[PDB]
Design a protein around this ligand. Structure first.
Ligand code: HEM
Ligand code: HEM
Ligand code: HEM
Ligand code: HEM
Ligand SMILES: CC(C)(C)OC(=O)NCCSC[C@@H](Nc1ccccc1)C(=O)NCc1cccnc1
Lengths: 457, 457, 457, 457
């Protein structure tokens, strides 16, 4: 249909099939498709998700123009995504003025100030993690990181968001953990979403049937569960409180539920998935593991409890986290819908085009990264951290729509790692997939789950 | 689904049925439904076209706020209408910045200046009208106005828009008149569009099938026919010329076709339908007919040819046209889609609500019109024309999005009537529907076509 | 659209709304709508589920013609039901020759012979039920029947179908009980299915998206779980065995899964729901409870273990079960799609019409039942059991497509009750809904769950 | 989805793309795709029209089994085709018992008896054809066959079906010819129908919107036009009469309209298209033209008027018609939907598979035709006509569902040619496309229309 767009504008790209566009090229996943296109075509290129034209861009100035400069004017929203039901009101999903309102109503929740107050509560579930791990370190049986990390990551969420306090690894069947684990980061290469991409005219069909990519049952569990806690604390420290206090243009109650749902997933599969990637890289590079175990003990001698300030003090820890996020940027791509005919850094961009930054492919670009497949934390030494274009390395996005939970996500993940490297070491098992292979699907996740050996220090 | 909207906001309205909303109430047509609601509920009210909330308003200040004040800011577009294909680019159909561009690129086409230049060509087809009529005035057989007026109205269009010059009543089968008559003002109460209103999620389905409410065949006839005339005049006075000269941000070629299509219908069924309504009212009020025949002869003695200036000179003619348009405002309603949460003249209007002015019901409101059903031209005497709220009487809309062809449409219609009342008189026949009954459907048209007796002066 | 059908044929019925047909009348549920129509219109009547014409019939001969006589010829299948995915192959859902094959391949599974072999295994979980109950009979706290019965009913299913052996009330979190409880008898008056009924043209839309009214996750759990047990028993007494042996025109493996799913639900919510209804009626009619506790002890003195033969010996037990099923026939209606133009017992029935028997309304018809709302088991005394038209009383359907699991369902339910009335008695609590109110929705279930007092004999 | 079908059954075919199946291979049209598959794969093969599995077959016994033997049992209907509206009732479109009824109610209309009675009326419009042609034979200007033949072919239809009698080439604008020319043989490779094939789940969507591949306006013209003529002849020789007499299980009135529509097209574009193909082959093989002009004059000396009997007498005329139909079999393919699991001539054919005979590819198969691209009428000499497998050469189909109008179509076409070769000869013009190229689309029609020189004998 609209498959002449890039051929006119003089932008190169893979030739689209009728109806499908270029989607059959996703058979190795977004990341691999993005790398190929980068090499085959250079700095800019175009392709079609069904009839949806997508313009990839790799110029840091141009990227900065889209993500920062012209964000409010032209590139305000992300690719429409449906069917979502009442989740239209989630911040990550909302548009234009509604999003601007929600970003405001929700920003002070994520300050360095409020973040320092969540430390002692986040500190408490680190210790729960250790005990579950030593039960396996004392029973010489290899460990799947995702289960134990997610048990931890969930434990922090439920708490930092509603006060609920479960040992999700040892009380995994209590009514709360059941619903909350039923979140699934959406495989955009799964049967369902490829059908969307080729039949996006079916989203409104599904919307009028109250179908939701968020299971209609988990949402109902928390919609009421919030209006219980809402009326329990009212009247008699967490995200809900910080959002309830805000509605005192102000936030509504079902909007509040929707943000709660986004926050819960946000820090579940993500925090847990990033922790897994770090632990893998640690186990397969044992020296880095040792160098970090030294710094954790120098700043916190005698296995001293990590504090907010001791965490920012640690610099090799930061380097490890960053270099992991370079090799596994869980978002893979950034995207904005171009809402007006515009011209940025010398290129005409018509209305409706989705503009896409290929984060995974830029993190692995040899034109900016020496030995880009190698896990080498020193790239982020304060000697070299200045050489790195913040518009090439973008694991949390950028501009007015970057990751709202970035600080919290780094803090949470580091508090988990300080505590864990104070007590154990991590070894490849025979069953450990080395080298790790990324799922060919639509998520940045390992093909096989990560299994390692855990020895008690 | 969204059927609680007005019940929350505290706006009264007829209770909606699931899925249908209030559409079953259209069984007497928009106009009658609008009158009822006006009386039942007062100054504002709400209802649902399927799941689409519609807020009717009748305050002239509030109407002025929507149609003029906040037009560019909030109320810029009309109710989405599909499937349209390439006709998305027609001015009457286009949105936001695209419309603003098209209104600019097309405005100077409709000036008092360019309009004075179309007079002598529009004058020529008036004489064709007379001859066809006297062939019936000399053959004592009653006449259907729509056929003879449309023959005339078409004759002016084809000319004033492309130079083509046919006697569409006597050369009705030439290739051009066949396609051009295949326009149909859309019965929004017909089977098809009621299905849209209850399944608007099916428009995108139909759009991806290249289905068009404008027959895919007539459009193809003129798409090429334009790019012929385009390349005939280039290189070797009408709307096409005025649009071709404009593309010399500038107008494209298929956009040019689309405007051509809108203009052709615009002045066909409308001009012809309004002429019919005037002739009816004239025949059933013979004194008004006489008073106007006197003024036509005082300004143009000896059946003098009407000129642009002699036309504006005529004031009872104007009164007749206006008072007809009061009783038959062919648009019935005006509408704008509310693009932001706003508050106008003290009422909150949420995003997405269609705001509707019920022109037909306001033209017939006894709270502003004495004996409103009576055809009484003197309402528009220069003694009384000042008493009339331009926000109650709105046959051409208002504000930046009023009828672009208003001046031309009045001129064309008056040039037709001066010539015709200079030569004939018009009498009720036995077959004449008295009093006229409006089609219960979705157009302002007579139930039965208007048949009259035509006697040669 | 097709809303003239019954008006032509001369069959009376409620006047249908456009698009909706008569569905708004479901606001009190099928059962109440059926009763009204029966009284308002008499022996036959028509109505529209959207555009779907439905002919209700209440003549026992005519009912026998449809359900038995012309079953194979004309009335072979049930109302199309979608989207179902691979569940198209379930027996209860399948059509024409495929169903005939599946009914054959699955019939010997349900014989009096094989049924006598399942007794000792079904006997074992009765004792599990007692212990869970006395833990509540010794802790003076009222009991919700559905939870304790479903715990039991599940326990029998998992066993009688796959050998799996869980105390689902005390091991409720083991991986098997989680998936298996995620069956939900479909509320055909819920948002989703009313949308089907008005947009049945959307089923094929949903089918091509691999959407399934059976959650795509539970099905995957058992599809593989079967092909595990399949390859565990092969090679090294239950329904799976009886189906695996059958494929040794023969049954396939995914067909086998689908039957497994139908059987699991079939005996879960149903058996458990019917048990609840009996216990309610028992508690609110304490004499019937006593009369039955006497017969259970006469045939099984000293709390003797019930056997297959001792179960059929018990006749007042049968009367209780039957009279409960009269007042709560969980299917509510029977239905067949008329596959040919036919004429049965003097009435023309066009192709495509769904023919419906209103079981609930016939069970409550005063023209066949004295004091029909009264729970009076003696109606089914061997003195009166002969007076009862098997085409008026139809809790298991009739003809070649009656309930395949009828015998098993009666046996299972009676083995549960003999054991339970041998040990406890059942008393109304203050919280007990008396009289019970049927859910206004699309299932025969109580508005409020049934809570009773349980005292240890 | 179902794209494993042929890979399992062990049938070879082109590998299908997701969603598209093999449809992209239609870029050279069905005929060319069919030839390739025949050569690449042999006697049987499979492919996918979207998700629709299609099994091509080329064994004459197997073809006879499908088209004749198992027609009523298994292969009764053609590939579902929609949206059709009330045209569901046309015979060529109807299914199962409804079709069997319509074939009966309509068969005696097409007998050798009734056909002999239509001769003198069909004879009359032959003479109209001559005069229009000599007006061009006397004005040395090349002639487009389709216009002049269709003018003739229409003239015979309107007459033989309703008595209406127009000179459609010289009265082409009368109200009847306008609607009747608005039939269009459907380009199944046009945008619309390829969208069906990939979204056949959208047919029911369109059916519920009263959209029709037969324009909703032409159908309305004749629905009423029939019920006028119906009530004009009733009460005060053609197909309508023969159908009206039949309803005196019997035919209804709107069914009657629908058959009328099928018959009108059937003999319009087809008869006219076949005539064009013959005239082309005649002009480009001048000896065949001469040999036939001799036989026409031997049987009809002195330009004697052809009679029914003189027509069957002519044998080289028959040979010409047949050999043309070999090279241009306007149906291209025959098709039946397999309604049951069956096994025919040693191959398993699952339910739902469309079984397709590739007539065009078999007519051009070198394994049955010497020099198959050559136009050589002698193939059909009574010496060689016996060598020809009626299951390889199938321009009118075969079995209970062959072309109902075959005899009439041959008669009509031959009466046209006898008259025309009695008076003119036909010569290539410079503008004549030699060799003719078949439209790459979805019809058997020439790329360019056929233009020839016409000289008066
Ligand atoms: C290591 C873990 C995480 C990574 C790598 C990450 C990365 C990202 C990225 C790349 C985006 C899009 C940014 C852009 O488009 O410019 C994003 C958006 C977002 N993130 Fe995260 N994120 C992480 C964890 C979290 C957490 C814990 C939260 C908790 C609240 C969170 C909340 C959000 C929200 C609400 C958005 C939408 C922002 C908006 O649209 O206004 N994320 N994240
Ligand atoms: C007596 C005849 C006519 C009447 C009563 C009439 C009335 C109207 C009305 C009520 C509107 C909507 C105005 C609003 O929303 O505020 C409109 C819009 C419009 N009219 Fe007319 N009209 C007539 C004839 C014509 C003619 C001859 C043309 C020739 C070009 C024309 C072109 C248009 C266009 C293009 C629009 C869309 C304006 C825009 O969206 O920018 N109309 N007309
Ligand atoms: C007290 C509990 C139950 C009741 C009241 C009941 C009632 C019914 C009814 C009314 C039908 C439709 C019959 C007809 O259309 O004529 C049916 C069908 C069916 N039932 Fe049950 N049923 C019960 C329990 C079960 C159980 C335990 C099974 C276990 C396998 C089962 C399996 C089936 C199947 C497979 C069908 C479809 C029959 C076919 O289409 O061939 N039902 N049941
Ligand atoms: C030279 C011109 C024609 C050719 C080559 C032709 C060929 C065919 C073919 C191949 C079929 C399908 C047969 C099969 O599936 O086995 C068919 C069906 C049919 N034809 Fe023709 N035909 C011609 C002219 C006509 C005419 C003039 C009529 C006039 C009534 C007609 C009426 C029909 C009908 C009604 C069917 C559907 C048969 C059924 O489904 O029962 N055709 N034709
Ligand atoms: C007639 C019957 C009650 C069997 O089916 C229907 O009414 N509709 C036709 C097909 S969908 C009902 C379907 N439900 C279900 C199945 C699996 C998981 C969850 C729900 C079904 O067949 N269940 C078996 C059954 C139910 C009741 C009595 N006996 C057997």
């Amino acid at each position: 249909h609209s498959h002449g767009l890039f051929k006119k504008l003089g932008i190169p790209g893979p030739t689209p099939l009728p109806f499908l566009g270029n989607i059959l090229s996703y058979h190795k996943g977004f990341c691999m498709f993005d790398m190929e296109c980068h090499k085959k075509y250079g700095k800019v290129w175009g392709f079609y998700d069904g009839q949806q034209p997508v313009l990839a861009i790799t110029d840091p100035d141009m990227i900065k123009t889209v993500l920062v400069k012209e964000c409010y004017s032209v590139f305000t929203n992300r690719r429409p995504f449906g069917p979502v039901g009442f989740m239209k009101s989630a911040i990550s999903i909302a548009e234009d003025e509604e999003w601007k309102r929600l970003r405001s109503l929700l920003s002070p929740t994520f300050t360095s100030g409020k973040l320092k107050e969540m430390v002692p509560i986040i500190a408490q579930y680190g210790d729960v993690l250790v005990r579950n791990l030593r039960r396996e370190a004392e029973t010489g049986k290899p460990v799947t990181l995702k289960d134990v990390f997610g048990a931890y990551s969930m434990d922090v969420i439920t708490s930092t968001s509603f006060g609920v306090n479960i040992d999700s690894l040892n009380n995994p069947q209590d009514p709360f953990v059941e619903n909350t684990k039923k979140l699934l980061r959406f495989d955009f290469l799964d049967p369902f979403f490829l059908s969307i991409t080729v039949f996006p005219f079916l989203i409104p069909i599904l919307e009028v049937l109250n179908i939701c990519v968020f299971p209609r049952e988990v949402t109902n569990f928390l919609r009421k569960s919030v209006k219980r806690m809402k009326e329990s604390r009212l009247e008699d420290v967490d995200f809900l409180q910080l959002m309830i206090d805000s509605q005192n243009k102000a936030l509504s109650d079902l909007e509040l539920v929707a943000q709660s749902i986004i926050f819960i997933f946000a820090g579940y599969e993500t925090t847990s998935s990033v922790l897994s990637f770090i632990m893998y890289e640690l186990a397969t590079h044992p020296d880095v593991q040792q160098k970090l175990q030294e710094e954790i003990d120098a700043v916190l001698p005698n296995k001293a409890p990590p504090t907010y300030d001791t965490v920012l003090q640690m610099e090799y820890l930061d380097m490890v986290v960053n270099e992991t996020l370079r090799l596994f940027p869980i978002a893979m791509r950034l995207e904005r819908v171009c809402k007006k005919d515009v011209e940025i850094n010398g290129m005409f961009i018509p209305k409706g085009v989705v503009v896409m930054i290929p984060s995974y492919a830029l993190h692995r670009d040899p034109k900016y990264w020496t030995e880009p497949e190698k896990f080498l934390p020193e790239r982020f030494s304060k000697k070299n951290k200045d050489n790195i274009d913040p518009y090439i390395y973008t694991p949390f996005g950028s501009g007015p729509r970057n990751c709202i939970g970035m600080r919290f996500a780094l803090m949470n993940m580091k508090l988990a790692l300080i505590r864990v490297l104070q007590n154990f070491s991590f070894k490849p098992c025979k069953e450990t997939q080395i080298p790790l292979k990324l799922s060919l699907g639509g998520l940045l996740q390992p093909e096989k789950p990560v299994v390692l050996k855990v020895e008690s220090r």
